[PDB]
């Protein structure tokens, strides 16, 4: 609402109350083709998301919560004192690409590439995910994933040649008997517009995420709320 910089203020201006949310997501995992959408709505002052996402084909071939890290960063909540390494407003409205490859041990690898932009007044996620290698009875085909998400803490890089920020970063998932299914993510983003952006110190974010279900819907979905927020500079 007031900062020095008017290049944090363009940023923050775009965020400053709720904003609706679109997530489209086309997949193919191991031949399985799919498609997610999701809508919900974003408040970056509290680091807060609510979603709703439907799988639209029918059933999901692999467990929800190996899709949470796929399915918006730029509704983290920056302290004040952090705003100048908010990457992720700065690339607004033209956007960023968030690309992924997400390696789950002894499995196969989804490799992501999503476009986060406004169209208008909302913010659109247009994800497509291929996923390769997966084993017929292991924990993602087999779904032997619990549903539920645990709190992590993930480290932010400026990558200053390609004026965007990269991360890499394990993921643990619970699976039914106690044990946990790895999920290494690398991640880098780039701004789609030619624009100057905030490229960071180092940093990370704190998330925390929630799972349930909407017990009148009968399609395929889940229900998410997530909250993140930056940390780490004093």
């Given amino acids: 609402h007031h900062h020095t910089d008017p290049m944090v203020s363009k940023g923050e201006e775009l965020f400053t109350g709720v904003v609706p949310i679109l997530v489209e997501l086309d997949g193919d995992v191991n031949g399985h083709k799919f498609s997610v959408s999701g809508e919900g709505e974003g408040d970056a002052t509290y680091g807060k998301l609510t979603l709703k ?3 639209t084909t029918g059933k999901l071939p692999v467990p929800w919560p190996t899709l949470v890290t796929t399915l918006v960063l730029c509704f983290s909540r ?17 956007g960023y690409v968030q690309e992924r490859t997400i390696f789950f041990k002894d499995d196969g690898n989804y490799k992501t590439r999503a476009e986060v932009k406004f169209e208008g007044d909302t913010l659109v996620n247009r994800i497509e995910l291929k996923g390769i290698d997966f084993k017929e009875d292991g924990n993602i085909l087999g779904h032997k994933l619990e549903y539920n998400y645990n709190s992590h803490n993930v480290y932010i890089m400026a990558d200053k040649q390609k004026n965007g ?16 299914q790895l999920a290494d993510h690398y991640q ?7 624009g100057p952006v905030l490229l960071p110190d180092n940093h990370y974010l704190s998330t925390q995420s929630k799972l349930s279900k909407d017990p009148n819907e009968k399609r395929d979905h889940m229900v998410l709320l997530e909250f993140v927020t930056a940390a780490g500079i004093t």
Avoid at 81 to 87: E, G, T
Avoid at 188 to 193: E, V
């Fill in 53 to 55: 996402f439907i799988c």
């Fill in 78 to 94: 920056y302290p004040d004192h952090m705003k100048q390494h908010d990457f992720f407003k700065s690339a607004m409205p033209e």
């Fill in 165 to 180: 920020i990269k991360s890499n970063f394990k993921i643990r998932h619970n699976i039914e008997d106690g044990s946990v």
């Fill in 188 to 194: 880098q983003n780039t701004p789609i517009g030619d």
